[PDB]
């Protein structure tokens, strides 16, 4: 996240950190995700597409730091890794960029609630906040586009949703943005999601609940003027989510 503040998992208890094992010994961060129900985390298919080997990923809940442990964190293996079959990537956009990971611990259980682990709500079919709503994004992604490392502390920031009309202006993303995407930016193009934030949540209040309105998907640069962050529009995938969970 470019801008924002550092936070702790208590402020985003549904955030999931996904890592990959290289049996040479290292475990590297891949993407973020969000806990939907005790056994399911949702992220982005582009995070897994290149290495769909579920056995090589580890999912952690209750984590405030990237490589050090947080007291209360829970570690899970991926029992099922569902990627969207119509996932496509083009010159910028990723279409149908949503993925589901069914998690299981070594004891064979799913997540348990704690002050650091909570689920986030799903919107109702095709229901979104209106553009102008301020939503927050969280993640361990880059703080500057030129960095090659990720922060160790979790960060969060606020962005506002903008209209498709505005995001589809030729000088923004044109028709790269579809109705199955949402665009969010900071009025001053100062804070935004960046590399490493993929898979994470765009949370907005909807009907009184903190709802998972988007999944960090793609963007040109990070915090670039007229280059919003594009998120998968969760509200438009509810049938898909329900069919697999």
């Amino acid at each position: 996240i470019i801008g924002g503040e550092f936070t702790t998992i208590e402020n985003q208890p549904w955030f999931a950190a996904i890592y990959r094992r290289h049996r040479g010994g290292s475990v590297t961060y891949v993407c973020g995700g969000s806990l939907m129900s005790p056994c399911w985390v949702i992220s982005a298919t582009h995070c897994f597409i290149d290495y769909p080997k579920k056995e090589d990923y580890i999912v952690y809940l209750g984590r405030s730091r990237l490589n050090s442990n947080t007291q209360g964190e829970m570690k899970f293996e991926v029992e099922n890794l569902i990627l969207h079959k119509d996932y496509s990537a083009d010159t910028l956009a990723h279409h149908n960029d949503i993925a589901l990971l069914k998690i299981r611990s070594k004891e064979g259980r799913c997540a348990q609630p704690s002050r650091t682990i909570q689920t986030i709500c799903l919107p109702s079919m095709y229901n979104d906040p209106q553009f102008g709503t301020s939503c927050e994004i969280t993640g361990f992604g880059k703080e500057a586009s030129t960095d090659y490392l990720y922060p160790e502390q979790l960060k969060m920031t606020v962005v506002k949703l903008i209209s498709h009309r505005e995001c589809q202006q030729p000088h923004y993303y044109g028709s790269e943005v579809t109705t199955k995407m949402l665009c969010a930016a900071d009025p001053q193009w100062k804070t935004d999601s960046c590399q490493g934030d993929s898979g994470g949540p765009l949370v907005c209040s909807l009907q009184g609940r903190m709802t998972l309105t988007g999944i960090v998907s793609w963007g040109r640069g990070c915090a670039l003027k007229d280059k919003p962050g594009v998120y998968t529009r969760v509200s438009h995938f509810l049938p898909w989510i329900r069919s697999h969970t």
């Binding site: 985003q12 129900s37 609630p113 002050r115 909570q118 689920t119 986030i120 609940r209 903190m210 709802t211």
Partner: peptide
């Protein structure tokens, strides 16, 4: 009653 019921989506504690 079973742990799961304690999840309240959207709540921070």
């Amino acid at each position: 009653p079973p742990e799961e019921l304690k999840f309240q989506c959207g709540q921070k504690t």
